[PDB]
Design a protein around this ligand. Structure first.
Ligand code: NI
Length: 229
């Protein structure tokens, strides 16, 4: 009751300025199996060569999360112009509609980030854009529906932890009722409920009463506790 999406079976789309790998269907990459997982609809693993970026485009009715891993990303709303450096997340629920344009401010540095898309619990909510700096050990709480423990709000019944584990560490994750979970291995090597997973792999667990996660090495993962069906 555990599916392993290996890194090299993500949809690949290199564009010259943007190399990108898609955990799910997205743009000119379509597979009916790899559609979505619960509310996780998009996990994109993007490298954006120095100086390049997406032009002025419009999102609507979607809670979008960016997690920057290397370099920096400038973000220009319409009216923001705040940056986001390596290590900080940045959300933006869109609801009624918005128009933004993201780019790589360095001319010497590649930008590498995760692009995450979670279907919000209702459309037409008010545009909003939080952006925090959420370490080296521990399971951080990045997204939650009430912004508890210093997390950010996400307009969906789901939490997102940035678990950072040291070699041979092992914690359990409570797992709720009919809930589902996605692990996205950021770096390293882990073992979840028997299933090994390395950098950029993703595992999708459901109909399971608990999650044992064994850091086969120092490794960071992203955990999506996601609601049922
Ligand atoms: Ni965008």
């Amino acid at each position: 009751m555990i599916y392993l999406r290996k890194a090299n079976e993500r949809g690949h789309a290199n564009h010259g300025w943007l190399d990108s790998w898609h955990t799910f269907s997205f743009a000119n990459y379509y597979d009916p199996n790899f559609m979505g997982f619960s509310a996780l609809r998009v996990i994109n693993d993007d490298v954006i060569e120095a100086g390049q970026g997406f032009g002025t485009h419009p999102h609507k009715d979607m809670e979008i999360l960016t997690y920057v891993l290397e370099g920096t990303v400038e973000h220009q709303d319409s009216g923001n112009k705040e940056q986001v450096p390596a290590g900080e997340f940045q959300i933006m629920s869109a609801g009624t509609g918005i128009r933004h344009s993201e780019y790589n401010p360095s001319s010497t540095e590649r930008l590498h980030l995760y692009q995450i898309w979670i279907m919000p619990e209702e459309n037409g909510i008010t545009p909003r854009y939080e952006q925090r700096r959420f370490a080296v050990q521990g399971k951080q709480l990045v997204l939650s529906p009430d912004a508890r423990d210093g997390s950010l709000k996400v307009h969906q019944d789901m939490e997102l932890y940035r678990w950072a584990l040291l070699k041979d560490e092992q914690s359990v994750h409570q797992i709720a009722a009919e809930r589902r979970v996605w692990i996205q291995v950021v770096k390293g090597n882990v073992t979840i409920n028997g299933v090994k997973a390395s950098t950029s792999d993703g595992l999708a667990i459901w109909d399971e009463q608990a999650i044992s996660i064994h850091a086969d090495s120092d490794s960071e993962v992203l955990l999506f506790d996601l609601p049922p069906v």
